[PDB]
């Protein structure tokens, strides 16, 4: 699996691929690994599929409830804190996952949460078997000054690089952009395919 989240001035961009394996066996070419969990909040999942899927349902439910109760969206750091508590509480019978939570409150944020509930905020982050390849691309190419269009191309390049070198990564790249102005927008596949072409990449 490869997932990525980056922050820009007033934007978060999150992306994943879609390959689901049982060891070397590619069972599903089109799994979903990127989810809207609130108005301005997205999450990516890596690790054990059943565990990650249960947490997505739990987060969608809880953030909806919290929103109705508080009349405002859960702050992104509060999302990461809740997950942190939840995952640490079962650390000896854990959810075997790596999570990125990304969103906009008064500012853009990306958090990376591990299976023991350790949560760290970063300007960008990547999870899954493909993440080392992504971190190479981002280290070399990320700039805090990038436009959303440049950041979208960046995550596409990073995940395409990971697909070339991680056999557990593959399939169509899914991308969402989160802004205060436009909310959570999943980019249409046709748009991502177009950028893949114009960048000289494959799939």
């Amino acid at each position: 699996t490869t997932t990525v989240g980056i922050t820009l001035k007033d934007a978060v961009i999150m992306a994943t691929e879609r390959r689901v394996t049982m060891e070397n066996f590619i069972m599903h070419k089109n799994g979903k690994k990127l989810f809207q969990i609130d108005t301005y909040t997205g999450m990516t999942i890596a690790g054990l599929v059943g565990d990650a899927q249960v947490l997505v349902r739990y987060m969608k439910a809880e953030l909806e409830l919290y929103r109705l109760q508080r009349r405002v969206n859960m702050p992104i750091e509060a999302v990461a804190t809740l997950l942190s508590n939840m995952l640490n509480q079962v650390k000896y019978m854990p959810y075997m996952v790596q999570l990125l939570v990304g969103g906009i409150d008064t500012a853009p944020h990306v958090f990376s949460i591990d299976a023991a509930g350790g949560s760290v905020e970063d300007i960008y982050a990547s999870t899954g078997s493909g993440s080392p390849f992504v971190y190479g691309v981002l280290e070399s190419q990320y700039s805090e000054k990038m436009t959303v269009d440049e950041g979208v191309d960046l995550v596409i390049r990073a995940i395409s690089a990971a697909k070339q070198r991680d056999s557990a990564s593959g399939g169509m790249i899914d991308v969402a952009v989160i802004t205060r102005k436009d909310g959570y927008v999943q980019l249409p596949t046709d748009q991502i395919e177009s950028r893949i072409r114009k960048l000289g990449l494959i799939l």
Binding site: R57, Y58, K60, L65, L68
Partner: protein, 221 residues
């Protein structure tokens, strides 16, 4: 809560008296949607208005309005919100709103059969969209449920229901329905009376709920 010789549960009938004292609210189905309107016992400029919510969202597609003991009502709304989430986690969606209303009503029924507790002094109207279509239900202290095209709860219930009995028609445009609703609510008021700005919320098939802002409500007054 025990039976009288005529088979009545007086403690539940008394809980029903508490509900009659509450503020008036109504719901009605219209073309591809459903709406709720609530009057408010606002008295005092010292009160915050924005914090008042007689119409309470249960989820993005389901809302309720209540009448009777206000603290009891909050507990049942909280219950409905959590119950709705539990269904959504289990199945991935809420296919039929009637099942949620039944779980809330079952909670109320329990408090009429077991000793050591009193019934909830609350009636609720639930309205929303599910896979069947736009839905409108009410629920009383006994946990009795009914599905309606239009209905009302609270002190003005009888006047609003009489009005709607005479004036309601199915498949109105939203604007016309809201107009009818306001007229229905106004009919329940006493000698020479407005009617300050009520709360209005509506939903149509394929959309989420919308809560009318103070200024959109003014247009109907």
């Amino acid at each position: 809560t025990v039976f009288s010789p005529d088979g009545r549960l007086f403690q539940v009938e008394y809980a029903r008296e508490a509900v009659k004292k509450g503020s008036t609210a109504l719901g009605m189905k219209f073309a591809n949607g459903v709406l709720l309107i609530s009057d408010k016992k606002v008295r005092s400029r010292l009160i915050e208005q924005n914090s008042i919510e007689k119409i309470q969202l249960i989820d993005d597609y389901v809302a309720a309005v209540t009448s009777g003991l206000v603290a009891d009502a909050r507990v049942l709304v909280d219950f409905a919100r959590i119950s709705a989430q539990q269904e959504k986690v289990t199945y991935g969606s809420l296919v039929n709103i009637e099942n949620l209303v039944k779980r809330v009503a079952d909670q109320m029924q329990q408090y009429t059969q077991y000793g050591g507790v009193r019934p909830y002094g609350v009636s609720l109207i639930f309205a929303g969209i599910d896979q069947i279509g736009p839905r409108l239900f009410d629920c009383d202290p006994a946990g009795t449920i009914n599905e309606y095209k239009a209905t009302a709860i609270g002190s003005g219930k009888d006047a609003v229901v009489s009005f709607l009995e005479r004036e309601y028609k199915e498949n109105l445009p939203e604007k016309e329905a809201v107009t009818l609703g306001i007229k229905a609510l106004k009919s329940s008021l006493e000698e020479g009376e407005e009617l300050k700005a009520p709360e209005i919320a509506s939903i149509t098939v394929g959309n989420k709920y919308r809560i009318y802002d103070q200024e959109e409500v003014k247009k109907f007054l």
